[PDB]
Amino acid sequence: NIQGITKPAIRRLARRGGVKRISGLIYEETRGVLKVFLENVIRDAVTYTEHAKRKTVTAMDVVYALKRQGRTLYGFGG
Amino acid sequence: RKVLRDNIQGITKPAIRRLARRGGVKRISGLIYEETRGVLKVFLENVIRDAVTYTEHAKRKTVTAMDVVYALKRQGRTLYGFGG
Amino acid sequence: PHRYRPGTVALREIRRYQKSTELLIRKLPFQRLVREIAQDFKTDLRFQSSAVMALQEACEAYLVGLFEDTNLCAIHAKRVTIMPKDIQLARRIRGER
Amino acid sequence: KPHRYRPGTVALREIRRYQKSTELLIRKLPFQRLVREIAQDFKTDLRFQSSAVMALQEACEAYLVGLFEDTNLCAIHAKRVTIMPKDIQLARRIRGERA
Amino acid sequence: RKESYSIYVYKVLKQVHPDTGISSKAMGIMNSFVNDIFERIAGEASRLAHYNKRSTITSREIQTAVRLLLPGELAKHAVSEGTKAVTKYTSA
Amino acid sequence: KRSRKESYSIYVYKVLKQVHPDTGISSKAMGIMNSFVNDIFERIAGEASRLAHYNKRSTITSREIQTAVRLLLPGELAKHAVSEGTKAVTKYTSAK
Amino acid sequence: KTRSSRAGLQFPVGRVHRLLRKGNYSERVGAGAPVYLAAVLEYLTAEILELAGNAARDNKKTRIIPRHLQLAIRNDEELNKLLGRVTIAQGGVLPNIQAVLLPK
Amino acid sequence: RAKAKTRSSRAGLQFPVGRVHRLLRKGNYSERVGAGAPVYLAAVLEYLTAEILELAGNAARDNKKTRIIPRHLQLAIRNDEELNKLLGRVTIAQGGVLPNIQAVLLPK
DNA sequence: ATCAATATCCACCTGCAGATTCTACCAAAAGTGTATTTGGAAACTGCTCCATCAAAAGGCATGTTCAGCTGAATTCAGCTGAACATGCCTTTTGATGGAGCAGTTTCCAAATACACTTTTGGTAGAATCTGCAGGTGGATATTGAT
DNA sequence: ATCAATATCCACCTGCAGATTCTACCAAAAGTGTATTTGGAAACTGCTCCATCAAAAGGCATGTTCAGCTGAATTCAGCTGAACATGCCTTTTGATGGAGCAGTTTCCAAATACACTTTTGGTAGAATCTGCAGGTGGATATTGAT
Ligand SMILES: [Cl-]
Ligand SMILES: [Cl-]
Ligand SMILES: [Cl-]
Ligand SMILES: [Cl-]
Ligand SMILES: [Mn+2]
Ligand SMILES: [Mn+2]
Ligand SMILES: [Mn+2]
Ligand SMILES: [Mn+2]
Ligand SMILES: [Mn+2]
Ligand SMILES: [Mn+2]
Ligand SMILES: [Mn+2]
Ligand SMILES: [Mn+2]
């Protein structure tokens, strides 16, 4: 599934980041980082889900997860 | 009392070298000493500013270790060893 | 047969994407990965659509920000090309490692 | 001879020495003097518990040391062994202390 | 149920830009903003009162919290507004 | 006219003897240990407090503490902390 | 006759009070605290809406969208410092290309 | 009235269950605090100080000392992956740092 | 491949600044007998959430070409490390005065608690509108070529 | 810098749909009017601690020499990563239903908060104990010159 995050899409992110030239190994490196990021955030969110005894991860769960990870996000209930 | 001036120079070249040594640095360009002083001063001002703000809020004239500890916690530089 | 020199179109893409705000990762693939990772912590979960969107917004902002630091690290090394080495340095200094 | 250690040898001796110890590396009085000067520029007539000055020195030194490690990685990354203001600035920017 | 600062953000929007509107998403951003700053001021005032073994959060804790949290000019003006509203509130 | 200030020193010291009967601790080290306990206490309580608030709950139970501990502690540290906590509670309730 | 009108504010003093009490911040809450806190929140909100409105106008838009809120925050030294650990969904980033990467 | 049993002894703990329960009620964490909460928290706190004292005592042993000092606490924290992450933003006064020299810096 | 020159270790020693214990209250747990909640436990809804289905369309995966970037190899001016001579000023030890925390009481202005009375903000349809997404048509910016 | 030929941008308009804004109404807050509780300010003042001073000593900060070897420039070419024309399929996206499920109610037995009344567990010093900081000295490297 993570290979689903494609080279060109990673190129795009790098572009919005101001990157001009990209090494061929960046794509796999980026996927690894992206995965650790999602695991960390989702783990916390699901923990808020489970605590609330729900079967549905809510935007709020993610928002609270992001806040704990020092990644505060505006736009989804805080 | 007596005018306090230029005390930043009290942070000597050898003291900055020692600190870089503990930090694992082998070689140091001649301009590092002035950069370091500038960074130290910014760091110190921000912590002292918050510590003194906690001091003033308690209507005290004496900045306490706790004032500094709380200032550091705010700045995300938690310090163990002075919580008495 | 017209052809742009290497770097010319890249610079053009930077200007385009730094101008917009649309998510840059295709939605379905991303949603798929989110659910796969989540499945390892708790099975048979459902997701509010906005939950998936928050994660993608958070994820892409993080990556974009991370690429900026990586870029700064590459330039610091007299390069114009980013490498795993640059990503690694940035994450180390950030304290993510 | 006179005997002379090659440049870099003593520096490495110093790294091992200071990474072994935990004593504060900046002289006490001078540092207390700096704290009093900065504080005074913020609010006159302030007093400090001796303990408060030490908490600050412990924190400033832990901070500088950590910053130098980061600076050192930025230099090595530039294929250098000599830290420069450039590296400190890169480290501080990535640390988010001054993007 | 489900209250938000929307009504209020919008009113304030009209005072500064009577001519300007705001999208739903942008409104969502403003809500997040207000909730966040509210939590930060409140939390800090909470600590200030606890550090000083006080059981009540007065405008004095709110002010110091503001000084501790907002950068320079933002802090000055916020403080100015704060004491201004308390003054007016106590007069009549 | 005393001004007494509490601490965890007595408890830290007991746990020390349990793990290293032969070992002592300097006051500075005990100072560090005290800051540590107070710090993790605040982090756990803080997280428990938030958790309860997000769930319209007015009371913090062993369950909030548990989920707070899982959120705060990394891997193995969490698993073991959760076991000790759970154990202590069941013991405590079993009147045990 | 509400407390807000008395305080001369648009933001809800009564709600800020209920939120302070129900937020487990302290055992008691002064009467001025909600007024002060409410005024601070309204002011910062006006600051962002002002600058964000300007960003819209300079884009030939009359409706403020996330992009505008991001441009206002990031182009303002103070607002940026205050929200440096926050991400505005759908805001993108400021256009900026490292000099060294430009042509010729 | 029956003879008093401390909640700690009931919980089978060294850490103060009563103290922790009080600290919880007076810390403005929630309107009410459950009976198990202080027990569960005291246990986790006791377990964590047991884990760091174990590793610190060992560092003391390695440095041939019988008394744990700050440096021992540091060596134990920074050398343990999990404790290091948990206290990754913490500074131990008089702890120094781990001896560590980047390879590129050693005599070529 | 040696050796001087020094730096680095490790074990043996010994009183004392810094722990460990030993004592004594007393602040704060613990034991009890009531007075509230509280958070479930079932029972049922209106929903947001998966599932397919089912097309079409960009958007992605490929194979080519080669521009130009990264790295390796060489130089070399001079920055910065190692050593030394000098002697300044941080450290140490103690002694005081008294500024200003901290402990105690005394006690209103101010906050908490209801019991009601009004009022406003959250909802769910209804009546506009701001841009998005195209469509040109016109200078621009690029890159090959004199 | 021009000449020329692609492709890129870039204003100006323009037409509707997706949202916005505008309306029409009800419970859940918010505002009152009283009646008490109380937090923590004001008034001493006991007394830790902080600011200063004196003074002698040697650990270190300063400066200066000198030259090792590191950073900064150059040059060069092998080959990685950009630009692209191609061909195809995974992502979009739009209903259509069905349903797993957040959200609400209604009780209530279990769990908490309370208001007192005893009972120790802790904390603040004295009274004891003792690691180990500092000193010394050979054994052991560790370096850097022939
Ligand atoms: Cl690499
Ligand atoms: Cl530089
Ligand atoms: Cl108040
Ligand atoms: Cl419980
Ligand atoms: Mn053991
Ligand atoms: Mn209304
Ligand atoms: Mn357009
Ligand atoms: Mn009272
Ligand atoms: Mn070199
Ligand atoms: Mn070539
Ligand atoms: Mn006893
Ligand atoms: Mn020794």
For residue D17, give its domain range.
Answer: 1-99
> Structurally, how many domains does chain C consist of?
1
Q: Which residues in chain G touch residue A18, judged by CB atoms under 8 angstroms apart?
A: 96-98, 101
Three-state SS for H91? strand
DSSP state of C6: T
Q: Do D77 and C72 touch (CB under 8 A)?
A: no
Cα(D79) to centroid(ligand 9), Å: 8
In units of Å, what resolution does this entry have?
A: 2.5
Helix (H, G, I), strand (E, B) or coil at F24: strand
- Chain H CB contacts of D22 below 8 Å: 70-71, 74, 94-96
Size of interface F-G (CB pairs under 8 A): 3
Contact of E76 with chain B, judged by CB distance below 8 Å, is answered with no
Token duo for residue F76: 């193995």
The encoded tokens of residue A25 equal: 């190994």
What nucleotide is nearest D13 when CA is compared to C1'? I7
Contacting residues of D for H105, CB less than 8 Å apart:
12, 15, 76, 81
CATH number of the domain to which G69 belongs:
1.10.20.10
Ligand 4 is an ion; residues with CB less than 5 A from it: F 61-62; H 34, 36-37
Under a CB-based contact definition with an 8 Å cutoff, are residues A12 and C11 in contact?
no
- List, as own/partner pairs, every contact residues E73-81 make where C-beta atoms lie below 8 angstroms and the sequence separation is at least 24, other chains included: E73/G78, E74/G44, E74/G47, E74/G78, E74/G79, E74/G82, E77/G43, E77/G47, E78/G39, E78/G40, E78/G43, E78/G44, E81/G39, E81/G40, E81/G42, E81/G43
Experimental method: X-ray
CA distance G24 to E57: 11
Residues in Cβ contact with H55 at an 8 Å cutoff, skipping those fewer than 6 apart: H76, H77, H79, H80, H83
Name the class of domain A1-78. mainly alpha
Instruction: Please list, residue by residue across E46-64, b when 16 or more beta carbons sit within 10 angstroms of its beta carbon and e when fewer do.
Output: bbbbbeeebeebbbbbbbb
User: Which chain A residues in 12-41 lie under 8 Å from chain G, judged by CB atoms?
Assistant: 16-18, 20
Q: Indicate the DSSP class of residue H4.
A: P
Report the alpha-carbon distance of residue H59 to residue H66 in Å, rounded.
Answer: 10
For G87, half-sphere exposure in the C-beta direction (CA atoms, 13 angstrom radius) is 26
C14 touches strand J (CB under 7 A): no
Collapsed DSSP state (helix, strand, coil) of residue C81: strand
C-alpha closest to that of A33 among A10, A17, A12, A56: A10
Q: What is the CATH number of domain B1-84?
A: 1.10.20.10
CB contact under 8 A, D72 and H106: no
Query: Domains of chain E by range and CATH?
Result: 1-92 (1.10.20.10)
CA of E4 to the centre of ligand 6 (A): 15
What DSSP assignment string belongs to G14-50?
HHHHHHHHHTTS-SEE-SHHHHHHHHHHHHHHHHHHH
Chain E 16-75, CB below 8 Å of chain H: which residues? 46, 50
DSSP H helical segments within F1-96, as ranges? 9-19, 27-54, 62-72, 75-93
Q: Find how far residue A8's CA is from the centre of its chain.
A: 18
Domain that holds residue H5: 1-108
Contact D81 H98 (CB under 8 A): no
Q: Which of G24, G27, G28, G85 should we substitute to test contact with H (largest number of H Cβ atoms within 10 Å)?
A: G24
Q: Which residues of F touch H62 (CB under 8 A)?
A: none
Look at residues C45, G21, C50, A65 and name the one whose alpha carbon lies nearest to residue F51: A65
Tokens of H99: 């001896």
